[PDB]
């Protein structure tokens, strides 16, 4: 099954796309691995039911204690751990989705305009409205704020994930087991039931290791996201213009005339 | 499995589409997470069958009490909780579906007409039927009512969801367990059966947490829907016109001449 | 899984299509929800097997009583309830399928003819066979009968569903449990078997609630279907014609000249 | 799951196609419903194993008696009931498949020839080889026999299904239970085993009801198939010709000139 | 599930294609029905484990005896019965696959050549290289041998299937049960184990019936395959030619000029 | 399920493609049949746990002995048998994959060149660079070595498979059962555990038969692969050329002029 | 199921693509085989629960010890072994993904430029900007570093995998079993529980063998990756140029003029 999942992953700036794809793809992959393993192991929790307890009496304790997790804080995390990772995946995904609707329409029209004007310059020279436009964008700060927000939000989500994972991972090794008391209501007075059942969370060992992998990847991912902020350090015939220029570099692949001019410039 | 579900979500105004997509996509996602977890845990309820009860005698109590939930109000909600979320997803979806059939055909023809007339103005000027038409739409209130209803219905459904979730979430912490009596009919006289079986709802802890996530998202979603109502606060050669204008802004991406004129206007 | 089902629903008159889509889509959705829940709960019925009975002896009673349901009337409905809903879905679907083959071919040719003639009038005026044809259709009652039958059949099926659901829902609350006797044939003389086993239908509580949802939707759907019958109350260069006119209104989206003429008419 | 199956059905003469589609689609649908329910109930048969029998000893009787069904006639039908319905579906399908290869190639070429000749007549008149051809087909009885056979075979299969279902349905109510003896071979001498185990077929109640639905539909379908035989009772510029004429009526949707001429004829 | 399988089947000479499609499709269908039923019944074999045996001790005998089938001949067939049918399906499929690569390339080029030459004759006459070619093919026996082999192989495989099924079916009724001894190795000396366990093959009753259906179909299929051998008994401006002529008849659907000439010939 | 698998198989030289397709498709098919049966039987191994052992104590022995297979040689093969077949499928597949990248690009360009030159000769004659090229290829041995290696590797893999299967098949009949000792570590001193558990491999009987089928097919496949080596024994206006000529024969289907010239040559 | 997986694999330099495809495809295939087998065997671990322990008491030890693996080093590897292979697959995949975004855009534009210039030379000669460009690339070392890094990273990952697998494989044979103590917390004082439970990892035998297969393949893969580093040893009318030349060789298939010139050169 794992190959079926991975083959999908094997068979806007590229760096930013990779960061987003990694930030969201990795936890989803990690979550899937846990469940693929969980379904293979069967149950997430097990309790020492007394030998006198029937299979459902034992099963009752297991399910009861699974719910009792909410009635000691780490225990709560263990039960909802996959959802927290899922939350991070979604939170890391919102910057790209928000970007797709808030910035992509503006950028698409603007780039095509610039590209067409550049080709007109190339064709005319062989045979500056766009420059005045671009110079105006140098005075604008509306689009750069849109980009800063996506990276800023992603960065903050990553920090929260790193801190969260560190707290989780460091405390995980000591919270695998807890004492659950099912003596509630009428059965609080039952003497045939032990005062507490020792229950162990089976997936904690997996989640604990998975958290470390995720922590390391995000730790490596932090400086990559930081590097996107150095925009100015990132072309003859901290301004929005710098952002357009960076996008121009990413779309140079589309500029047919630029390729020709680049060879001429290189020769010269 | 969760990645299989999420990858579908990862791989009319945009803001309104996002609101609708979030309002309906989130609960469906939440419902799926519960079942993905429920199938992994196995059963939704468990009862303290006496140790003398056989596996089906124990199983009988569990299934019996599951049905007995209807014969104390929160208990009823817990059993049908996924359906209530599903109900909200459908109810939040009707405004978009109703909009698709009641408004989209009118708007499609109207926008294309306006776009074509604008291009004719652009072409002719380089070389006002539409203005008289648009001015008439300023006197019309038929289409704006259609939009108001979709947002109004969605907004009301959200409020109901927020109130419902708040009632559910606040009471959830105290209703995880209930005492079920299977002593009905002939077996009401059976002395080998305890007067009541203490049964615990296993998914309540998950649903309770899921409700909080959903509550927070809808709480954040309310002002977003409210913001759509500020239409007037939302372009040389509270009227339906304001709505057409807003749709024109959303479709500026299609206006080729507008892009050119916008650069000229910016330069000027 | 529910998201997988719902996403298909999220990702001839429109009103009639919605009515048909709702009338058939809703019960299918409801049926699917029951089974999705049923598979999660495991079994539809459970019986108090004596503690002396082995797992298959207990299982035998459960399966036996499940069949015994036919040997008190509500009990019969509970077992076949999903099929009854499925029957309604199919019965509500036949009017659309019958319409597709009995009316759609006639209407398609007729509309395209009218549309082409209207465009010829528009083109010629700028530069009445169809009127004489349409006037003849005003004297015809062959096609309107086809439409009346589809709405009439759908309406009748809805009434039957509403009555059926009301009878089912009102009686459901009292028929969750029944006394089953497996003492048949040779085992009628077995003293180790109780005279009757108290068995409870587990899905009745779900079906009972689902019936109420379906009942409410159909109750709201009845007046919508009724509204289609007010055809006459439903455009310079109770007759079949009224039906063609109504279809013309639905296909105005296709009339390019009409859009232009409508703006001119509005201006005038 | 049922919605997944039904959505495929929701999302040569039309009447004959409907008859074939119904005759084959209905039993396949019915078969699928049984298995969808059977998989939800778990087992098709259950036997009163003595309380001294272990789970496999009980399981052995169930499986043994399931096979013993062949060693009283209705019992045999119950086990193979789905296959009998499947047999009917296939048998009802052969007339259409046989028709597709034996008649469709002849009819396709013949219709297109006629259609082209009719258009040539229309074009020439505005500006009789086909008539002599058609008149010859009036003297031919080769193609009508092909059609008669498909309807005849389908009709006969339906009658057999109706008789079969009636015999099955009427006897079903009395054959739900049978006495199975596993005392064969070496274990014929085992005194710890009862002389017979009372076993009950669990799916009989479902199949019995399903047979009634199928019986009613086929009973309604019989006169529809019969109506196809009244070919003669079924268009200025019992012969194969009557069959071609009937096919011409079905393909009038394709005749562009006929539509125009029909309006002129209607006006005249 | 059965509908899912059948819908694929519902939604080179045609007769030969049908024969091949039936010869291979039927057993595959039959095999699928067995497994669809087998998965619903659970296990293929069951043994009378003593009541003192634990669930795995009982399970051990069942699995042991399932393997012991090879250590009385019919028993062997029952275990591998699906594979034998699968073998027949593959063996019946090889003639078509072999035909696809050994004959189809030759025939495709030859037919198109003939068709083009016939059209050239038609066009020229209105305004004999191919005849000399065809006359040469009358002297050739290379291609007819290719066809004879495919039918011959298919025919022989059918006879073997018919004989095999007859032997299987006739003996099946007496070999449902066998006595299995697990007293091997160290446990040959165990006195707590009975000398033999009576085990019954659960699927034999199904396979036995399925074999009869398959036998009847192949029995009807034999004369159909035989009829293909009567090639000579099978068109003005036992030779390979007879085979080309037969293929010409199958491809007359493609000959546009032939259709026109056929009407003229019929009129004349 | 088997039909689902087979339908994919039912619905570079052709002989070599068939050999490769058979050599790889057959074992994959065989492997799938084993697992389809294995999943239907449930477990691959079973051990005589003492009647005093609990279900997990019995289950422990089964799983323990399954691993103990590695701590007598045939036993090892039985556990990994599917992987060995899978290994053969992959090993038989590498020659085709290697061929696809090492030879197919060269051959594609070369054939198209030859085909174009042949058409130029045909067109010019009606109205020798390629001959000098081909004559040079007669002096080259670079491409023939590429072909020889693919057949040689495939042939060797087949021989190894035949020898392996023969060793496996011949020894299989005697190694179905083995004595497993779980008395290791602390439990080596447990007197409640028998010194050895007699365990039987359940799938050996299936694998043993499957090996014979595979052995026979490969035995028939050996001479087919050998026949490919007789290249010289395999067309007016052991050299690489012989290989190109053989490929030309396979691509004659594409040569339009050759078809025409072949008829002329045949007539002459 | 295995055929379903394999058929996907059966139905930038080619050598490098094969290396990457093998390096990543093989472990994914291996991982899938383990899980396909694991799901067929059921559980990954089993412990000698005392015969007095109930099924959940036994199940508790199994699940407990599965988690206890983290509280002797090889034991840790066995639990996470599939993830380690998955880690290698991803790590081997990053060089190709990184290459796709960091090098593929540059190479695509550069090759097409060169190809177009070569065709211009061919056309002009029959009837040196690119040479000066290429000569400049000979002085550049920017792109070769990109390639070196992908091979270097892949190579290092392979070495780590080889060392890791060797350590794992060599130690695997001695770490199949471990002694697990569940006497923690309150149950540390329970005398009814043995001081340690002997637990055996069931999948170790499979993983151990799989590691050897993977080790051998990577061992063979190492020299293949090394061979890519010998770039200089790898065409009239250690420099980046050498890399472009190597890519030119891979894309010669696209050069139509080169093919013609190659034949002329060969003839000359």
Query: What is the domain extent for residue G136?
Result: 2-262
CA distance A214 to A219: 8
Choose the closest CB to E46 out of D53, D63, D185: D63
Q: Which positions in chain E touch D24 (Cβ < 8 Å)? A: 10
Residue of chain D whose Cα is closest to the Cα of E49: D57
CATH of the domain at E97: 1.20.1440
Mark yes or no for CB contact D82/E2 under 8 Å.
yes
**For F179, phi and psi rounded to 5 degrees?**
-100, 120
Instruction: Return the C-alpha torsion angle C205, C206, C208, C210, nearest 10.
Output: 160
Q: What is the dihedral of CA A245, A247, A252, A256, to 10 degrees?
A: -90
Asked whether the beta carbons of E215 and E165 are under 8 A apart, the reply is yes
The answer to whether residues B180 and B68 touch, using CB atoms and an 8 Å cutoff, is yes
Contacts of F177 in chain E (CB under 8 A): 184-185
Among residues C207, C180, C208, the alpha carbon closest in space to that of C196 is found at C180
Selecting from G55, G60, G184 the residue whose C-beta is nearest the C-beta of A47 gives G60
Q: What is the DSSP letter of E234?
A: -
- Determine whether the interchain pair B49/A54 forms a contact, defined as Cβ–Cβ distance below 8 Å: yes
User: What resolution (Å)?
Assistant: 3.6
Total residue length of chain D: 268
DSSP G201: E
Nearest residue of D to residue C63 by CA position? D202
Quote the minimal CA–CA distance from G136 to chain F in Å.
Answer: 30
Burial of G167 (0-12, 13-18, 19+ CB in 10 A): middle
Q: Which member of B2, B49, B177 has the closest CB to residue A32?
A: B2
Count CB neighbours of F244 within 10 A: 21
- Both tokens of A215, joined, read 């922590």
Total structural domains within chain G: 1
Residue found under tokens 């037969």: E246
Judging contacts by C-beta atoms under 8 Å, the chain A residues touching residue B41 are 43-44, 63, 66
Which of the other chains make 3 or more beta carbon contacts under 8 angstroms with chain A? B, G
Q: Walk across the sheet containing D45-47 and list its strands.
A: D45-47, D197-201, D177-180
Residue positions counted in chain G: 268
Alpha-carbon gap: E175 to the closest alpha carbon of chain F (Å): 19
Q: Which two tokens stand for residue D101?
A: 């290869």
Q: Strand, coil or helix: what is A183? A: coil
Pairing of strands F45-47, F197-201: antiparallel
Nearest CA to C107 among C246, C253, C244? C244
Task: Specify if E232 maps to a domain.
Answer: yes
Is the minimum CB–CB distance between D60 and chain E shorter than 8 Å?
A: yes
Q: How far does the CA of residue F112 sit from the closest CA of chain E (Å)?
A: 19
Residue by residue, DSSP assigns G60-89 as HHHHHHHHHTT--HHHHHHHHHHHHHHHHH
Rounded alpha-carbon distances, angstroms, from residue A237 to A118, A256, A265: 10, 15, 11
**How many other C-beta atoms are found inside a 10 Å radius of the C-beta of residue G180?**
23
Contact residues, chain E, for F169 at CB < 8 Å: none
CB-CB neighbors (< 8 A) of E70 in chain F: 173, 205, 208
C-alpha to C-alpha distances, A34 to A27, A40, A42, A209, nearest whole angstrom: 10, 10, 12, 10
* D146 reaches C (C-beta below 8 A): no
Can you give chain B as a three-state secondary structure string? CHHHHHHHHHCCCHHHHHHHHHHHHHHHHHHHHHHHHHHHHCCCEEECCCCCCCHHHHHHHHHHHHHHCCCCHHHHHHHHHHHHHHHHHHHHHHHHHHHHHHCHHHHHHHHHHHHHHHHHHHHHHHCCHHHHHHHHHHHCCHHHHHHHHHHHHHHHHHHHHHHHHHHHHHHHCCCCEEEECCCCHHHHHCCCCCCCEEEEECCHHHHHHHHHHHHHHHHHHHHHHHHHCCHHHCCCCCCHHHHHHHHHHHHHHHCHHHHHHHHHHHHC
| Partners of chain C (3+ Cβ pairs below 8 A) | B, D
Euclidean distance between CA atoms F174 and F180, whole angstroms: 16
- Give the DSSP letter string of D125-181: HH--HHHHHHHHHHH--HHHHHHHHHHHHHHHHHHHHHHHHHHHHHHHTT-SEEEE-
Return d(Cα A183, Cα A172) in angstroms, integer: 27
Radius of gyration for chain F, computed over Cα atoms and rounded to the nearest angstrom? 28
Distance of residue F241 Cα from the nearest chain E Cα, in angstroms: 23
Identify whether G68 is part of a domain. Answer: yes
Element (H, E) at A197: strand A197-201
In angstroms, the CA F98 to CA F92 distance is 11
User: How many Å apart are CA D244 and CA D181, to the nearest integer?
Assistant: 62
- d(C-alpha C139, C-alpha C133), whole Å: 10
CA A111 to chain centre: 28
Sheet holding G177-180, edge to edge: G45-47, G197-201, G177-180
Q: How far apart are CA A56 and CA B55, in angstroms?
A: 7
Q: E14-41 vs E2-10: helix axis angle to the nearest 10?
A: 170
Quick one: CA torsion of F149, F155, F157, F160, rounded to 10 degrees? -140
Contact present, C34 and C182 (Cβ < 8 Å): no
Which of G53, G63, G111, G133 to mutate: most A Cβ within 10 Å? G63
Give how far D266 is from chain E: nearest CA, Å. Answer: 33
Q: Do chains C and G touch (3 or more CB pairs under 8 A)?
A: no
Kindly determine whether residue C205 and residue B66, on different chains, have CB atoms separated by under 8 Å. Answer: yes
CA-closest candidate to residue F160, choices F74, F91, F79, F82: F91
CA distance C109 to C87: 33
Residue F212, token pair as written in the block: 């014979």
Q: Which of D43, D54, D132 has the CB atom closest to E53's CB atom?
A: D54
CA separation, residue C70 to residues C74, C186, D169, D174 (Å): 10, 20, 13, 11
How many Cα atoms occupy the beta-carbon half-sphere of F240 within 13 Å? 18
C153-176 residues labelled b (16+ CB within 10 A) or e (exposed): bbbebbeebbebbeebbeebeebb
In B69-88, the residues whose Cβ lies within 8 Å of chain A are none
Contact residues for C94 (Cβ-Cβ < 8 A; gap 6+): C153
User: CA F178 to CA F62: how far, in whole Å?
Assistant: 12
Query: Left if phi > 0, otherwise alpha if psi is -120 to 50, otherwise beta: which for F180?
Result: beta
Reported as type and span, the H/E element at residue G156 is: helix G142-172
Chain G residues lying within 8 Å of F31, measured CB to CB: 2-3
Cβ within 8 Å of F, E 179-238? 182, 184-187, 192
G neighbour chains, 3+ CB pairs within 8 Å: A, F
Using a CB-CB distance cutoff of 8 angstroms, which residues of chain G are in contact with residue F71? 176
Touching partners of D (3+ C-beta pairs < 8 Å): C, E
E27-64: b (≥16 Cβ within 10 Å) or e: bbbbbbbbbbbbebbebbbbbbbbeebbbbbbbbbbbb
Q: Which residues contact B105 (CB under 8 A, 6 or more apart)?
A: C253
Instruction: Tell whether F62 lies on the interface with E, counting CB pairs under 8 A.
Output: yes
| Closest-CA residue to C213 (of B32, B78, D3, B87) | B87
The number of C-beta contacts closer than 8 angstroms across F and G is: 122
- Report, in angstroms and rounded to the nearest whole number, the Rg of chain C calculated over CA atoms: 28
The DSSP 8-state label assigned to residue A46 in this structure reads: E
Residue G224 tokens read as 């293949």
Q: Report whether C41 contacts B63 (CB < 8 A).
A: yes
Chain C hits for D65, CB-CB cut-off 8 Å, are none
Taking a C-beta distance cutoff of 8 angstroms, is the pair C28, C214 a contact? no
Q: Is C48 helix (H, G, I), strand (E, B) or coil?
A: coil
CA distance B257 to chain C (A): 22
Cα separation of E240 and E143, whole Å? 6
């Amino acid at each position: 099954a794992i190959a079926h999942l991975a083959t999908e992953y094997v068979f806007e700036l590229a760096v930013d796309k990779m960061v987003t794809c990694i930030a969201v793809g990795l936890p989803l992959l990690l979550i899937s691995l846990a469940f693929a393993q969980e379904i293979s192991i069967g149950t997430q929790i097990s309790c020492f039911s007394p030998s006198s307890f029937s299979w459902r009496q034992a099963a009752f304790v297991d399910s009861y204690c699974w719910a009792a997790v909410q009635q000691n804080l780490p225990l709560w995390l263990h039960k909802f751990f996959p959802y927290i990772l899922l939350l991070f995946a979604i939170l890391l995904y919102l910057p790209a989705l928000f970007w797709r609707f808030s910035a992509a329409p503006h950028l698409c029209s603007d780039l095509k305009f610039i590209m067409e004007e550049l080709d007109k310059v190339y064709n005319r020279a062989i045979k500056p409205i766009v420059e005045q436009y671009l110079k105006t964008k140098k005075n604008s700060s509306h689009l750069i704020m849109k980009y800063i927000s996506c990276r800023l939000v992603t960065f903050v989500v990553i920090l929260l994930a790193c801190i969260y994972l560190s707290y989780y991972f460091s405390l995980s090794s000591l919270s695998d087991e807890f004492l659950c008391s099912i003596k509630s209501g009428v059965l609080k007075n039952d003497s045939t039931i032990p005062d507490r059942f020792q229950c162990k969370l089976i997936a904690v060992g997996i989640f604990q290791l998975l958290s470390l992998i995720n922590l390391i990847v995000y730790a490596l991912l932090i400086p990559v996201v930081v590097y996107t902020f150095f925009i100015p350090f990132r072309i003859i015939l901290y301004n929005d213009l710098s952002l357009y220029n960076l996008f121009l570099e990413e779309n140079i692949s589309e500029l047919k005339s630029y390729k020709c001019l680049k060879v001429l410039e290189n020769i010269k």
